[PDB]
Point group: D2
Chain length 309, copies 4
């Protein structure tokens, strides 16, 4: 590789990605995490939060379409949506493409980070924060949910894995959190979320934990170019099986809502739910359920742990 | 990050993978490429060829099942099979799992590398080289095919990308090479192959390989799968003149899997079928690609990981 | 090791220095070289030129004192001084500390780089560029000297190694360049310069520079000092036709230091003298070296960090 | 840099050396530390102990001549020598070159490591272990010294810096240890040692600690190519000032003892004791003295610490 500026990205405890930085646009520290935003010749702008890549300019459409539309499209008519996380503004951008959306509330803990995105990541938000239907709330998701009582048709959880024992993210991955979320869902409501990278137990544990809160839980996956990783996601609902696709339905909705998709197609979306034998077994055998009493977290070595926070 | 032994693996001109080595099993240089085999805590043994990871002990089953079975299963009764590349022996291993196979010819240019696999990579070959149905040929697959008139039902191409202008392997990625391969296929034959990483923002190797193959075969169908140990989404393809290789029936593939008592750890009939469902961006990249590699102007991979063409010799 | 921003610095073909960057101050590319200036926790601001560290905020005083004072102090009364290179402005700074100096001409080819120093590296120049006695010339030092007939008492050469065959700076390391420099020295003049890293097992750049200078000057004396921020032992040299630059007296240098009220943070009279005492292996390397860089066959540094010669143009 | 096998060497908390490995000769773990021996094109064979380079084939003569001869040459007639550390066998090799040496005892804690050197590092020992005057003892230096009562003309300490709070090396860098060493010195005896890297407080602390045990302590330094570092060393004695060089004396001894030196010369040896203004100030201002009660160690960030072991 060429000499020069590079960022050392943690991927696993045995593999590290060294990404070339052409120029550093912004780097700093908020009261919640460190951030690094740099120009790369391949993926364009890259945002690092702490030690892990958070998003890249040229592949984020894949991640955000994958994260948002399966839940939005499986819901016959989403009017009110709640986004937990998604600080770059792109999750909101995709949510706002559905014409039935009347209100989209985004709740994020780090206001300073959101400001970084607003000023240096216009490629992501593309003016979504200034949409009259959008409402930004800087606060702790649980705190907000515990206080508020408004309900939603769709809730999109776009958070980072609870890696690290002292990581407060642990409290956002417990069965109680998912029940709190479910409490804020209108009848027929669906929840969509990024559920950790998949590599030969974060995703299976999250799937199992969510299943302790919802009747129907369906894992789906997609390779995210800029992360160099296969990521797991899931849809959850008590009102119906979100992955029981009826012939032609998803396709009809995409056309009807005039969604401008660059990555997904109706058939590709449904194919994301077709899982390989090894993943199915991992999901099937998982027994750990994260709880407020004993919140699960991943060790630096990538192991599933559980004990009081 | 920690201190210790690591391997700096080329991925792209802007991204490098630094893999921790627990201990080095073997390293060396054949007249064709450099090789390194080491123990990693996450993926077990890792084989590096020159500057790129070639295979991983703990995830190779995913790569080899993906590479081999779609072609083998789309064929109603594969009896004669040709393997180009696959020096580790795992490709042959998967081919040999099909009881209809009577003969499997494997031709690869680097005999020394094959020897390293035989000695240090039993996890891959699992004895496949010694199968009575297996015939190992160390030679240029192109010279071998022109010098022979044997026919095959299925041909699997398992080679690394042709990096570098001076790389003679460029001649194994031209339209006349694929035409030569097609000339050795029985009437209902099918070719299956690994067709390069997919990273549309960086380069279009996969679409160039697909476009080149389309110039030699009537029906060409790309499929993809994420290879864990490579940290890359890989493209593959099925090609045939006799039929649209992706015009399945989940039912028929399922029945053939059961019939042949195929032991699969990654693929299932429905997942195999789903690999052929592509996203909009990949479809567009495949559709718009115009580069066709030919003996006159063979394509190669530039140090920037881009597909480029230039007159040979 | 930790995750975060780092700079991969070239040191040798087999050793690379990975330096943690706290934050990046400036980075860019002039028509001559790439530059990067960043904050490091250990050495403060670090300036990288292309792929090699050029200077460190916390240790530059060691490098600049070592580079400048031996020549300036061996001269009884340096009034006119020429500086070739030293774009940061710290070389000029040290030259200007000598109150006998009436004029200091600095010629460097990269004006944009000098501008980066002026704006982001005040720790180095400390206002030297604005000294009434300082004259800044942006130009090829060779074209400038041939186009002028001014004379100097001391000449300091502060340039990076000429890496690469196509590097026009190769012409600033030939015997005719040093002869040109000698042609602009007053009768008792002396030339002092940084003469490449010393790493005898890897290459002989320093001995090649010394051997080349010996072909233009009667008396040539190498001296060395370890530069903390470079993690390398560096060679330097003093050259003159008028006297053996190392035929000191600790007493005289001490008196000149006191006389000129030189504020030194690294050197002392006895330490400066000791830099000229070399070990057996270095002496032998210097003695046996036969390579003489000339305009006809200028020497350059190969990608393997070796000194090689080849006919120009 | 080229892709390939590399070793990540800690140097400081902000600088890391990535050294290319052409081939790995041997790698493993003893009950005391990890070891990595590899071929490098520049320095030849390189031995890594834990995370730091211990020695390189093509530059070790510089380190070992620098470590051994100043103490040996400043002693008018060394007959009995004690080496603490120096497991590669090269320290013994240099000591054995002095014809007045009748006995040289080498004490090292890691017998398995010594075996690694014997089998894979012949370039270092060059048969020195098989010299009739050599005696290898595998044991804890202090334990050995506390039990034994034999005395020596010269003691050479070739140990690694006490970096890390739990590092047992701390107990070999206390004023009590140096007093124990001094107790095993014949009258007129001298002690020579590697005293840590020098970089803008390990060396100054060791110098100060040793001075709390010996009347005359003289620091000297030399750049060690293979370490990419300036290293500090020191000579200590109660009988005389080891650095008060009388004209022509060192030179006469080298000739008289027919020493085959490749790096040192009499004038260069004496020049190693000429220190720069900044180093002299650091040595002068240092106030920390390592004690058995509160053994000093260096923090991962390179800071001088002191507390009970």
């Amino acid at each position: 590789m060429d000499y020069g500026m590079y960022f050392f990205e943690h991927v696993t405890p045995y593999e590290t990605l060294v990404r070339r930085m052409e120029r550093v646009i912004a780097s700093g520290k908020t009261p919640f995490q460190d951030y690094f935003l740099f120009e790369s010749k391949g993926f364009g702008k890259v945002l690092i939060l702490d030690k892990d890549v958070q998003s890249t300019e040229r592949d984020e459409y894949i991640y955000h379409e994958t994260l948002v539309h399966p839940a939005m499209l499986t819901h016959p008519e989403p009017k009110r949506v709640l986004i937990v996380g998604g600080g770059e503004g792109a999750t909101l951008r995709e949510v706002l493409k559905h014409p039935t959306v009347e209100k989209a509330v985004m709740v994020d803990i780090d206001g300073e980070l959101v400001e970084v995105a607003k000023r240096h990541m216009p490629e992501w938000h593309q003016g979504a924060f200034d949409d009259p239907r959008a409402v930004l709330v800087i606060d702790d998701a649980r705190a907000y949910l515990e206080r508020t009582e408004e309900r939603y048709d769709v809730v999109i959880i776009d958070l980072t894995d609870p890696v690290g024992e002292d990581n407060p993210a642990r409290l956002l991955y417990t069965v109680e959190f998912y029940r709190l979320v479910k409490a804020h869902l209108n009848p027929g409501g669906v929840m969509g979320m990024q559920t950790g990278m998949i590599l030969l137990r974060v995703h299976p544990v999250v799937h199992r934990t969510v299943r302790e809160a919802f009747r129907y839980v369906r894992s789906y996956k997609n390779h995210i170019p800029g992360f160099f990783l296969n990521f797991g996601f899931l849809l959850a609902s008590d009102a119906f099986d979100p992955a029981a696709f009826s012939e032609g339905v998803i396709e009809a909705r995409i056309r009807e809502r005039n969604l401008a998709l660059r990555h997904l197609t109706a058939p590709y979306l449904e194919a994301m739910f077709v899982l390989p034998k090894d993943l199915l077994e991992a999901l099937e055998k998982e027994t750990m359920v994260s709880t407020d009493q004993n919140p699960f977290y991943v060790t630096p070595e990538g192991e599933a742990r559980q004990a009081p926070y």
